[PDB]
Here is the input.
Amino acid sequence: SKLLELLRKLGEALHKAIELLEKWG
Amino acid sequence: SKLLELLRKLGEALHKAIELLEKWG
Amino acid sequence: SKLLELLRKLGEALHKAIELLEKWG
Amino acid sequence: SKLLELLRKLGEALHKAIELLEKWG
Amino acid sequence: SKLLELLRKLGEALHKAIELLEKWG
Amino acid sequence: SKLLELLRKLGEALHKAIELLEKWG
Amino acid sequence: SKLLELLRKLGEALHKAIELLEKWG
Amino acid sequence: SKLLELLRKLGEALHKAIELLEKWG
Amino acid sequence: SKLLELLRKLGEALHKAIELLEKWG
Amino acid sequence: SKLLELLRKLGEALHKAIELLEKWG
Amino acid sequence: SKLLELLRKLGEALHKAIELLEKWG
Amino acid sequence: SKLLELLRKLGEALHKAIELLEKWG
Amino acid sequence: SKLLELLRKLGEALHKAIELLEKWG
Amino acid sequence: SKLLELLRKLGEALHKAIELLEKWG
Amino acid sequence: SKLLELLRKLGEALHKAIELLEKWG
Amino acid sequence: SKLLELLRKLGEALHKAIELLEKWG
Amino acid sequence: SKLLELLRKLGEALHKAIELLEKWG
Amino acid sequence: SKLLELLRKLGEALHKAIELLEKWG
Here is the structure.
């Protein structure tokens, strides 16, 4: 349950990282 | 360019997938 | 509702993946 | 490459089908 | 209306599938 | 080889019919 | 054999459309 | 116009269907 | 409206032709 | 007895087609 | 066999009739 | 000119119906 | 306008042959 | 409903076509 | 070979999607 | 439960698509 | 090919997420 | 234990994404 929260948090970061890669790339 | 799109879509899908897993878990 | 949202995203990703396979193939 | 074309048409059909599902669900 | 677009695509896919069957057969 | 020709036409006819259904619907 | 099974579906499908085209037209 | 061309295709299909019936019969 | 009549007849035959072709094939 | 039917239907379709040709011609 | 020859010819006549309609339509 | 060939075909069809009739009658 | 009359007559005469063949067959 | 009926058929046909494409391919 | 597998999977997914559309529609 | 069945197939399909993209890319 | 590496990993993560969703769902 | 696999995969994907962001940025 605390893991899941952590899991979700990464997912959000990875999502943003890819969006950024798009904009810059 | 077309690849980067595909990446974003997988990121969005993944991101969403984890959000659910949290709701159900 | 959230499961349908995820379903769509996977459809969009799969659609793009196939378009790319066409371009490269 | 005519197969790829076929594949691409199935992707779209599937994509549309899922979107309709979402609308009705 | 969105269902009718869905059909068109199934018709296009079926059409191509048969074209392939002709070429290979 | 001739049965494949027949199928092809039926596919083309079905495709035309669906296109009409769109325009009218 | 398979083709004949296939053929009969195209005919079946094609019929369905026309019956609709008649009603709408 | 779309209707007119739709018919043409049914005429071509029917023509070929009869040709087959001949060869097989 | 007289074209839809004709369409139906064309459909109506094509149906018969295919049914026979199935039995013989 | 199957082919007779088919014959009748071809005659019915041809009759309709000629009636148009008259009107349009 | 003789009957079939008649069927083919009716199919050919019907095919031309429809092609004619197209030209005028 | 396209009308003529349609006639020719109707003449050929009729000339073969009659021929059949003779065999049967 | 004189061939349309002729066309009709041929069609009328075909019909009658077809009817007869059905009764005898 | 009639459209939904139609929709199934397209799927049924398309399904048959794909199976065949697999066996031949 | 790989492509054909992908084809089958798209067919299976599309088939399932249509079955749902039937139930819900 | 049908949706989960459906969703497993999209994932399966996409996997293939990506595997191909790897090999060809 | 660096984004293909990245792609693969997103596919692997998404695959695992889906498997979990299946079990828990 | 099945979610720590998912965790690791998200960490690895995020690592790759950041390495790219470094280079391009």
User: Anything to note?
Assistant: The two ends of chain F are 36 Å apart (CA to CA). Chains F and A do not touch (no CB pair under 8 Å).
